[PDB]
């Protein structure tokens, strides 16, 4: 069945640095955007919804809205990569990626932040 994997389930990061966390999923020879959904959250708070080849436009000022982005050029290589810049103490916690691309699955990644 469709399985999402992580190269690391824990990242330890320094305050003020930049961090990229990754989930991996099965590739086709051609990235079919119509079928792909990429969902990133921290705890239950949504960070990314990449649907139909489009990022869901957020209007609410939030912690993540200007510092978080999905590295879209990595999707065709089977990498869901979330880059968060200028890491803050509040960025510590449990992240989850859910990818749907035919089947669907999810994994969790913990981030610890040092100051």
């Amino acid at each position, epitope marked *: *069945a*469709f399985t999402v994997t992580v190269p690391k389930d824990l990242y330890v990061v320094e305050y003020g640095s930049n961090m990229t966390i990754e989930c991996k999923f099965p590739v086709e020879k051609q990235l079919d955007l119509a079928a792909l*959904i990429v*969902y990133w*959250e921290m*705890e*239950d*708070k*949504n960070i990314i*919804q990449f*649907v139909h080849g489009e990022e*869901d436009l957020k209007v609410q000022h939030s912690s993540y809205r200007q510092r978080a982005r999905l590295l879209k050029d990595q999707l065709s290589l089977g990498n869901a990569a979330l880059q968060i810049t200028d890491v803050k103490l509040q960025d510590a916690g449990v992240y989850r990626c*859910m990818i*749907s691309y*035919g*089947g*669907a*699955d*999810y994994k969790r990644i913990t981030v610890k932040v040092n100051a």
Partner: nanobody
Amino acid sequence: QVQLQESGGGLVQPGGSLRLSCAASGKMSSRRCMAWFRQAPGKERERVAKLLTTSGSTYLADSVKGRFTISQNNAKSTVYLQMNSLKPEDTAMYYCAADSFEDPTCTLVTSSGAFQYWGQGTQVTVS
């Protein structure tokens, strides 16, 4: 975290009706995306209904549009599937499922693999 428990299954003749309930508990944000899935023996779980609890926005699979309805109570501790005009092909174990997905993802994700929380299932037989 989240727990889900179904009730309401049974046996009806064609044209009959059943009402399923899913008693939902745990942090509301962790179960804002509610769904009903069904599994016939020899087949995969397939989604038939979706509700985002915060907006009330619902979605029904083409196979059940106009026959089934998904809803919740005021406290949002219970989610229902009202099943009218039942047909033999509706025979299956029915499951409630929950997760945290906001819309549009909640609407668009039909694979059972996406959902982390599940009820134990309830049998619906139409014969």
